[PDB]
Amino acid sequence: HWGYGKHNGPEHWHKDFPIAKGERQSPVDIDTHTAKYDPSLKPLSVSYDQATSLRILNNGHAFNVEFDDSQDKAVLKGGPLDGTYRLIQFHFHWGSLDGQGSEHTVDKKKYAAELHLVHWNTKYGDFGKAVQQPDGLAVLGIFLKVGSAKPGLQKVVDVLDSIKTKGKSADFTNFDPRGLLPESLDYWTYPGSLTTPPLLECVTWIVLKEPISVSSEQVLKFRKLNFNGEGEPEELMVDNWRPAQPLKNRQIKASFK
Ligand SMILES: O=C(O)Cc1cccc([N+](=O)[O-])c1
Ligand SMILES: [Zn+2]
């Protein structure tokens, strides 16, 4: 099955998921000189005051911080969106070294990591139905650079020891994802896809311009996770990013001048 190796990594995905070579795949390189300012875009509305985190999971590809999405508690609205999108989970992608890790790139620059806050459009009732629709998901993407520590991340970092291997989970209540956001909500937006299989073309991407800073120590703890299951040969969870895909017939729009 799919992964991030020589034998099963992104360059192989298309054999099981032919949409890999589709018209609206993610991630992409954001060419800042060609992304046009769109005065019709709205400010983003990120309403996470009532978000209810429940659990953290190592799924063998990343770790997921999961939320109770059984009510409108943590929602994304505005920006490029019509309607209301409920937070279901966040996860990251990162590198073996600080010079790579992000999925999106900015004028070909790779950041050390990228955070994905995944939301589904409430008009479709559940996540599984939403991923079948072109406007089913909104993913908020936030770059990480290595510098100062992010205090708001440390709760996440310190639980990782308990979910080292694939299939491990841990109770993870009361975590506030507001602590992961940068000061500005300036963004780029474009239509795209999930970045892991099944690679469905269901996402409005919203990529923030301003990275967050995390410390080397924080990112180092991400790189101690394992792709493998308990008591299998250790293969560190690093370089779990899909490279940029062809933009094709898409426009990337900027919310800012
Ligand atoms: O389990 C998975 O890998 C599929 C999946 C599920 C939810 C979000 C995703 N994304 O690309 O943001 C991908
Ligand atoms: Zn992701």
PDB file of C-alpha atoms in Angstrom, residues 14-249:
ATOM      1  CA  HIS A  14      -1.177   7.033  -9.786  1.00  0.00           C
ATOM      2  CA  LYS A  15      -1.264   3.243 -10.297  1.00  0.00           C
ATOM      3  CA  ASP A  16      -3.820   2.781  -7.517  1.00  0.00           C
ATOM      4  CA  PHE A  17      -5.267   6.273  -7.702  1.00  0.00           C
ATOM      5  CA  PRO A  18      -5.228   7.465 -11.335  1.00  0.00           C
ATOM      6  CA  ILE A  19      -6.669  10.861 -10.259  1.00  0.00           C
ATOM      7  CA  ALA A  20      -3.055  11.509  -9.206  1.00  0.00           C
ATOM      8  CA  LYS A  21      -2.516  12.793 -12.742  1.00  0.00           C
ATOM      9  CA  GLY A  22      -5.739  14.804 -12.688  1.00  0.00           C
ATOM     10  CA  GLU A  23      -6.526  18.425 -13.507  1.00  0.00           C
ATOM     11  CA  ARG A  24      -6.756  19.828  -9.980  1.00  0.00           C
ATOM     12  CA  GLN A  25      -4.088  18.078  -7.879  1.00  0.00           C
ATOM     13  CA  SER A  26      -2.372  19.452  -4.814  1.00  0.00           C
ATOM     14  CA  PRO A  27      -0.029  20.702  -3.599  1.00  0.00           C
ATOM     15  CA  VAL A  28       1.292  23.315  -6.054  1.00  0.00           C
ATOM     16  CA  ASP A  29       4.030  25.875  -6.208  1.00  0.00           C
ATOM     17  CA  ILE A  30       2.623  29.388  -5.418  1.00  0.00           C
ATOM     18  CA  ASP A  31       4.288  31.818  -7.791  1.00  0.00           C
ATOM     19  CA  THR A  32       3.870  35.016  -5.901  1.00  0.00           C
ATOM     20  CA  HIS A  33       4.411  37.144  -8.910  1.00  0.00           C
ATOM     21  CA  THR A  34       1.562  35.600 -10.788  1.00  0.00           C
ATOM     22  CA  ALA A  35      -0.994  35.140  -8.043  1.00  0.00           C
ATOM     23  CA  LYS A  36      -3.336  38.019  -8.589  1.00  0.00           C
ATOM     24  CA  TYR A  37      -4.882  40.092  -5.835  1.00  0.00           C
ATOM     25  CA  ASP A  38      -8.596  39.530  -5.894  1.00  0.00           C
ATOM     26  CA  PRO A  39     -10.441  42.428  -4.148  1.00  0.00           C
ATOM     27  CA  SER A  40     -13.603  40.329  -4.160  1.00  0.00           C
ATOM     28  CA  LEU A  41     -12.123  37.827  -1.680  1.00  0.00           C
ATOM     29  CA  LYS A  42     -13.231  38.164   1.935  1.00  0.00           C
ATOM     30  CA  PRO A  43     -11.354  38.028   5.127  1.00  0.00           C
ATOM     31  CA  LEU A  44     -11.214  34.591   6.469  1.00  0.00           C
ATOM     32  CA  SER A  45     -13.376  33.794   9.465  1.00  0.00           C
ATOM     33  CA  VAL A  46     -11.729  31.204  11.720  1.00  0.00           C
ATOM     34  CA  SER A  47     -14.001  30.499  14.657  1.00  0.00           C
ATOM     35  CA  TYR A  48     -12.304  28.004  16.926  1.00  0.00           C
ATOM     36  CA  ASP A  49     -13.401  29.206  20.381  1.00  0.00           C
ATOM     37  CA  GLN A  50     -15.502  26.121  20.958  1.00  0.00           C
ATOM     38  CA  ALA A  51     -13.328  23.560  19.300  1.00  0.00           C
ATOM     39  CA  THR A  52     -13.342  20.213  21.091  1.00  0.00           C
ATOM     40  CA  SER A  53     -10.299  18.128  20.471  1.00  0.00           C
ATOM     41  CA  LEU A  54     -10.648  14.497  21.432  1.00  0.00           C
ATOM     42  CA  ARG A  55      -7.767  12.323  20.368  1.00  0.00           C
ATOM     43  CA  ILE A  56      -4.392  12.113  18.550  1.00  0.00           C
ATOM     44  CA  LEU A  57      -3.735   9.344  16.227  1.00  0.00           C
ATOM     45  CA  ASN A  58      -0.573   7.937  14.404  1.00  0.00           C
ATOM     46  CA  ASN A  59      -2.068   6.653  11.170  1.00  0.00           C
ATOM     47  CA  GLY A  60       1.143   5.482   9.736  1.00  0.00           C
ATOM     48  CA  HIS A  61       1.420   8.592   7.389  1.00  0.00           C
ATOM     49  CA  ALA A  62       1.211  11.388   9.899  1.00  0.00           C
ATOM     50  CA  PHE A  63      -0.459  12.087  13.152  1.00  0.00           C
ATOM     51  CA  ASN A  64      -3.960  13.473  13.264  1.00  0.00           C
ATOM     52  CA  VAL A  65      -5.419  15.698  16.065  1.00  0.00           C
ATOM     53  CA  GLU A  66      -9.141  14.893  15.868  1.00  0.00           C
ATOM     54  CA  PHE A  67     -12.084  17.025  16.812  1.00  0.00           C
ATOM     55  CA  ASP A  68     -15.716  16.414  17.700  1.00  0.00           C
ATOM     56  CA  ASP A  69     -17.444  17.539  14.468  1.00  0.00           C
ATOM     57  CA  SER A  70     -20.953  16.431  15.596  1.00  0.00           C
ATOM     58  CA  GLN A  71     -22.018  20.053  15.988  1.00  0.00           C
ATOM     59  CA  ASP A  72     -20.984  23.549  14.633  1.00  0.00           C
ATOM     60  CA  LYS A  73     -18.279  24.218  17.109  1.00  0.00           C
ATOM     61  CA  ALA A  74     -15.115  25.056  15.199  1.00  0.00           C
ATOM     62  CA  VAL A  75     -15.909  26.441  11.748  1.00  0.00           C
ATOM     63  CA  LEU A  76     -14.208  28.142   8.845  1.00  0.00           C
ATOM     64  CA  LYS A  77     -16.246  30.522   6.745  1.00  0.00           C
ATOM     65  CA  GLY A  78     -15.673  33.599   4.560  1.00  0.00           C
ATOM     66  CA  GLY A  79     -12.550  33.983   2.602  1.00  0.00           C
ATOM     67  CA  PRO A  80     -13.217  32.314  -0.805  1.00  0.00           C
ATOM     68  CA  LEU A  81     -15.884  30.049   0.685  1.00  0.00           C
ATOM     69  CA  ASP A  82     -19.689  29.967   0.402  1.00  0.00           C
ATOM     70  CA  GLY A  83     -21.126  28.363   3.447  1.00  0.00           C
ATOM     71  CA  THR A  84     -19.805  26.814   6.594  1.00  0.00           C
ATOM     72  CA  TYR A  85     -17.049  24.300   7.003  1.00  0.00           C
ATOM     73  CA  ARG A  86     -16.518  22.255  10.229  1.00  0.00           C
ATOM     74  CA  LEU A  87     -13.117  21.354  11.575  1.00  0.00           C
ATOM     75  CA  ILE A  88     -12.566  17.569  11.683  1.00  0.00           C
ATOM     76  CA  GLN A  89      -8.786  17.176  12.136  1.00  0.00           C
ATOM     77  CA  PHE A  90      -5.411  18.700  11.712  1.00  0.00           C
ATOM     78  CA  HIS A  91      -2.118  17.107  10.807  1.00  0.00           C
ATOM     79  CA  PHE A  92       1.325  18.023   9.523  1.00  0.00           C
ATOM     80  CA  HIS A  93       3.823  17.180   6.839  1.00  0.00           C
ATOM     81  CA  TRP A  94       7.560  17.515   7.540  1.00  0.00           C
ATOM     82  CA  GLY A  95      11.034  16.787   6.404  1.00  0.00           C
ATOM     83  CA  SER A  96      14.100  14.832   7.409  1.00  0.00           C
ATOM     84  CA  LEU A  97      15.921  18.203   7.524  1.00  0.00           C
ATOM     85  CA  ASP A  98      14.730  21.792   7.906  1.00  0.00           C
ATOM     86  CA  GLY A  99      15.218  22.524   4.140  1.00  0.00           C
ATOM     87  CA  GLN A 100      12.198  20.438   3.077  1.00  0.00           C
ATOM     88  CA  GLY A 101       8.894  19.272   4.452  1.00  0.00           C
ATOM     89  CA  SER A 102       6.207  21.501   3.142  1.00  0.00           C
ATOM     90  CA  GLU A 103       3.801  20.425   0.453  1.00  0.00           C
ATOM     91  CA  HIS A 104       3.047  23.798  -1.014  1.00  0.00           C
ATOM     92  CA  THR A 105       6.026  25.872  -1.987  1.00  0.00           C
ATOM     93  CA  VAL A 106       6.325  29.631  -2.370  1.00  0.00           C
ATOM     94  CA  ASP A 107       8.427  30.683  -5.411  1.00  0.00           C
ATOM     95  CA  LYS A 108       9.933  27.093  -5.105  1.00  0.00           C
ATOM     96  CA  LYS A 109      10.869  27.682  -1.435  1.00  0.00           C
ATOM     97  CA  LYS A 110      10.167  24.696   0.774  1.00  0.00           C
ATOM     98  CA  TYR A 111       9.387  25.252   4.407  1.00  0.00           C
ATOM     99  CA  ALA A 112      10.328  22.854   7.197  1.00  0.00           C
ATOM    100  CA  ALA A 113       6.769  21.688   7.655  1.00  0.00           C
ATOM    101  CA  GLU A 114       3.138  22.433   6.781  1.00  0.00           C
ATOM    102  CA  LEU A 115       0.063  22.198   8.983  1.00  0.00           C
ATOM    103  CA  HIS A 116      -3.241  21.257   7.410  1.00  0.00           C
ATOM    104  CA  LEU A 117      -6.497  22.090   9.239  1.00  0.00           C
ATOM    105  CA  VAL A 118      -9.174  20.080   7.475  1.00  0.00           C
ATOM    106  CA  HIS A 119     -12.824  21.209   7.342  1.00  0.00           C
ATOM    107  CA  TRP A 120     -15.887  19.821   5.577  1.00  0.00           C
ATOM    108  CA  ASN A 121     -18.878  21.632   4.115  1.00  0.00           C
ATOM    109  CA  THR A 122     -21.830  21.192   6.373  1.00  0.00           C
ATOM    110  CA  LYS A 123     -24.242  21.268   3.392  1.00  0.00           C
ATOM    111  CA  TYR A 124     -23.194  17.677   2.642  1.00  0.00           C
ATOM    112  CA  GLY A 125     -23.916  16.327   6.069  1.00  0.00           C
ATOM    113  CA  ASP A 126     -20.805  14.199   6.796  1.00  0.00           C
ATOM    114  CA  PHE A 127     -17.181  14.079   5.724  1.00  0.00           C
ATOM    115  CA  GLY A 128     -17.543  11.008   3.580  1.00  0.00           C
ATOM    116  CA  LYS A 129     -20.215  12.669   1.475  1.00  0.00           C
ATOM    117  CA  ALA A 130     -18.315  15.946   1.313  1.00  0.00           C
ATOM    118  CA  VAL A 131     -15.183  14.434  -0.203  1.00  0.00           C
ATOM    119  CA  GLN A 132     -17.319  13.393  -3.156  1.00  0.00           C
ATOM    120  CA  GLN A 133     -18.064  17.039  -4.032  1.00  0.00           C
ATOM    121  CA  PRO A 134     -15.862  19.669  -5.630  1.00  0.00           C
ATOM    122  CA  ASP A 135     -16.616  22.110  -2.876  1.00  0.00           C
ATOM    123  CA  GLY A 136     -16.674  19.544  -0.127  1.00  0.00           C
ATOM    124  CA  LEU A 137     -13.562  20.478   1.894  1.00  0.00           C
ATOM    125  CA  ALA A 138     -11.648  23.555   2.887  1.00  0.00           C
ATOM    126  CA  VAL A 139      -8.108  23.008   4.042  1.00  0.00           C
ATOM    127  CA  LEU A 140      -6.241  25.737   5.784  1.00  0.00           C
ATOM    128  CA  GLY A 141      -2.519  25.359   5.179  1.00  0.00           C
ATOM    129  CA  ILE A 142       0.059  27.022   7.443  1.00  0.00           C
ATOM    130  CA  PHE A 143       3.820  26.868   6.864  1.00  0.00           C
ATOM    131  CA  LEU A 144       6.314  26.177   9.624  1.00  0.00           C
ATOM    132  CA  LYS A 145       9.792  27.557   9.823  1.00  0.00           C
ATOM    133  CA  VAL A 146      12.378  26.704  12.437  1.00  0.00           C
ATOM    134  CA  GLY A 147      13.323  29.427  14.867  1.00  0.00           C
ATOM    135  CA  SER A 148      11.543  30.345  18.112  1.00  0.00           C
ATOM    136  CA  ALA A 149       9.410  27.804  19.771  1.00  0.00           C
ATOM    137  CA  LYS A 150       5.613  27.836  19.328  1.00  0.00           C
ATOM    138  CA  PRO A 151       4.221  27.559  22.820  1.00  0.00           C
ATOM    139  CA  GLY A 152       0.876  26.458  21.508  1.00  0.00           C
ATOM    140  CA  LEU A 153       2.385  23.412  19.803  1.00  0.00           C
ATOM    141  CA  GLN A 154       4.192  22.011  22.854  1.00  0.00           C
ATOM    142  CA  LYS A 155       1.132  20.007  24.099  1.00  0.00           C
ATOM    143  CA  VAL A 156       1.201  18.227  20.788  1.00  0.00           C
ATOM    144  CA  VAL A 157       4.909  17.565  20.857  1.00  0.00           C
ATOM    145  CA  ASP A 158       4.882  16.167  24.328  1.00  0.00           C
ATOM    146  CA  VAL A 159       2.188  13.526  23.528  1.00  0.00           C
ATOM    147  CA  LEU A 160       4.046  12.127  20.542  1.00  0.00           C
ATOM    148  CA  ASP A 161       6.075   9.685  22.665  1.00  0.00           C
ATOM    149  CA  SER A 162       2.818   7.919  23.416  1.00  0.00           C
ATOM    150  CA  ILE A 163       1.931   7.422  19.743  1.00  0.00           C
ATOM    151  CA  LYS A 164       5.238   6.437  18.291  1.00  0.00           C
ATOM    152  CA  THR A 165       4.005   3.761  15.953  1.00  0.00           C
ATOM    153  CA  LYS A 166       1.248   3.224  13.435  1.00  0.00           C
ATOM    154  CA  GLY A 167      -2.155   2.591  14.952  1.00  0.00           C
ATOM    155  CA  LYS A 168      -1.435   4.122  18.316  1.00  0.00           C
ATOM    156  CA  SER A 169      -3.768   6.763  19.639  1.00  0.00           C
ATOM    157  CA  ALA A 170      -4.070   8.779  22.830  1.00  0.00           C
ATOM    158  CA  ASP A 171      -6.691  10.915  24.533  1.00  0.00           C
ATOM    159  CA  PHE A 172      -6.079  14.548  23.515  1.00  0.00           C
ATOM    160  CA  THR A 173      -8.744  16.728  24.930  1.00  0.00           C
ATOM    161  CA  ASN A 174      -8.936  20.444  25.420  1.00  0.00           C
ATOM    162  CA  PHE A 175      -6.325  21.397  22.880  1.00  0.00           C
ATOM    163  CA  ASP A 176      -6.850  24.824  21.409  1.00  0.00           C
ATOM    164  CA  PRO A 177      -5.859  25.073  17.744  1.00  0.00           C
ATOM    165  CA  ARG A 178      -5.903  28.870  17.954  1.00  0.00           C
ATOM    166  CA  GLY A 179      -2.417  28.511  19.325  1.00  0.00           C
ATOM    167  CA  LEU A 180      -1.170  27.273  15.971  1.00  0.00           C
ATOM    168  CA  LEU A 181      -2.241  30.311  13.934  1.00  0.00           C
ATOM    169  CA  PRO A 182       0.008  33.149  12.742  1.00  0.00           C
ATOM    170  CA  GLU A 183      -0.836  36.817  13.368  1.00  0.00           C
ATOM    171  CA  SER A 184      -2.054  37.513   9.792  1.00  0.00           C
ATOM    172  CA  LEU A 185      -4.781  35.684   7.959  1.00  0.00           C
ATOM    173  CA  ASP A 186      -3.582  36.909   4.543  1.00  0.00           C
ATOM    174  CA  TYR A 187      -3.885  33.984   2.163  1.00  0.00           C
ATOM    175  CA  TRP A 188      -3.617  32.446  -1.288  1.00  0.00           C
ATOM    176  CA  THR A 189      -6.471  30.270  -2.538  1.00  0.00           C
ATOM    177  CA  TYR A 190      -6.955  27.806  -5.364  1.00  0.00           C
ATOM    178  CA  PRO A 191      -8.975  24.670  -6.147  1.00  0.00           C
ATOM    179  CA  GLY A 192      -7.282  21.385  -5.562  1.00  0.00           C
ATOM    180  CA  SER A 193      -7.179  18.025  -3.951  1.00  0.00           C
ATOM    181  CA  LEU A 194      -6.396  15.929  -0.966  1.00  0.00           C
ATOM    182  CA  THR A 195      -2.585  15.448  -0.878  1.00  0.00           C
ATOM    183  CA  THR A 196      -2.782  11.798   0.205  1.00  0.00           C
ATOM    184  CA  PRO A 197      -4.689   9.000  -1.396  1.00  0.00           C
ATOM    185  CA  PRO A 198      -7.443   8.892  -2.476  1.00  0.00           C
ATOM    186  CA  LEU A 199      -6.309  12.316  -3.828  1.00  0.00           C
ATOM    187  CA  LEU A 200      -9.904  13.471  -4.352  1.00  0.00           C
ATOM    188  CA  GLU A 201     -10.435  16.763  -6.107  1.00  0.00           C
ATOM    189  CA  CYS A 202     -12.671  18.183  -3.358  1.00  0.00           C
ATOM    190  CA  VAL A 203     -10.665  20.921  -1.711  1.00  0.00           C
ATOM    191  CA  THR A 204     -10.671  24.700  -1.676  1.00  0.00           C
ATOM    192  CA  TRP A 205      -7.173  25.398  -0.507  1.00  0.00           C
ATOM    193  CA  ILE A 206      -6.485  28.423   1.694  1.00  0.00           C
ATOM    194  CA  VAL A 207      -2.718  28.813   2.290  1.00  0.00           C
ATOM    195  CA  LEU A 208      -1.664  31.445   4.753  1.00  0.00           C
ATOM    196  CA  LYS A 209       1.202  33.704   3.744  1.00  0.00           C
ATOM    197  CA  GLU A 210       2.695  34.132   7.177  1.00  0.00           C
ATOM    198  CA  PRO A 211       4.519  31.043   8.569  1.00  0.00           C
ATOM    199  CA  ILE A 212       4.589  30.099  12.165  1.00  0.00           C
ATOM    200  CA  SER A 213       7.873  29.550  13.941  1.00  0.00           C
ATOM    201  CA  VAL A 214       8.618  26.367  15.792  1.00  0.00           C
ATOM    202  CA  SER A 215      11.817  25.345  17.464  1.00  0.00           C
ATOM    203  CA  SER A 216      14.354  22.851  16.205  1.00  0.00           C
ATOM    204  CA  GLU A 217      13.566  20.818  19.307  1.00  0.00           C
ATOM    205  CA  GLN A 218       9.870  20.727  18.423  1.00  0.00           C
ATOM    206  CA  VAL A 219      10.421  19.540  14.866  1.00  0.00           C
ATOM    207  CA  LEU A 220      12.961  17.035  16.057  1.00  0.00           C
ATOM    208  CA  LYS A 221      10.275  15.349  18.099  1.00  0.00           C
ATOM    209  CA  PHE A 222       8.089  14.997  14.965  1.00  0.00           C
ATOM    210  CA  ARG A 223      11.000  13.181  13.317  1.00  0.00           C
ATOM    211  CA  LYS A 224      11.133  10.570  16.074  1.00  0.00           C
ATOM    212  CA  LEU A 225       7.757   9.201  15.117  1.00  0.00           C
ATOM    213  CA  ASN A 226       7.615   5.971  13.145  1.00  0.00           C
ATOM    214  CA  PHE A 227       5.790   4.977   9.942  1.00  0.00           C
ATOM    215  CA  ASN A 228       5.942   1.352  11.091  1.00  0.00           C
ATOM    216  CA  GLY A 229       3.772  -0.494  13.575  1.00  0.00           C
ATOM    217  CA  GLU A 230       4.909  -1.661  17.054  1.00  0.00           C
ATOM    218  CA  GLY A 231       7.770  -3.984  16.993  1.00  0.00           C
ATOM    219  CA  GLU A 232       8.401  -3.757  13.271  1.00  0.00           C
ATOM    220  CA  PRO A 233      11.685  -2.488  11.686  1.00  0.00           C
ATOM    221  CA  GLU A 234      12.026   1.126  12.554  1.00  0.00           C
ATOM    222  CA  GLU A 235      11.540   3.610   9.775  1.00  0.00           C
ATOM    223  CA  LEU A 236      11.405   7.160  10.952  1.00  0.00           C
ATOM    224  CA  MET A 237       8.362   9.246   9.991  1.00  0.00           C
ATOM    225  CA  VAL A 238      10.094  11.926   7.919  1.00  0.00           C
ATOM    226  CA  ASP A 239       9.544  13.324   4.422  1.00  0.00           C
ATOM    227  CA  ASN A 240       5.817  12.595   4.480  1.00  0.00           C
ATOM    228  CA  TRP A 241       5.124  15.303   1.869  1.00  0.00           C
ATOM    229  CA  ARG A 242       3.826  15.130  -1.681  1.00  0.00           C
ATOM    230  CA  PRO A 243       5.794  17.363  -4.075  1.00  0.00           C
ATOM    231  CA  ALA A 244       4.227  20.167  -6.085  1.00  0.00           C
ATOM    232  CA  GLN A 245       1.963  19.076  -8.885  1.00  0.00           C
ATOM    233  CA  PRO A 246       1.191  20.783 -12.220  1.00  0.00           C
ATOM    234  CA  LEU A 247      -1.014  23.824 -11.900  1.00  0.00           C
ATOM    235  CA  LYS A 248      -2.806  23.182 -15.219  1.00  0.00           C
ATOM    236  CA  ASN A 249      -5.701  25.324 -15.856  1.00  0.00           C
TER     237      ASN A 249
END
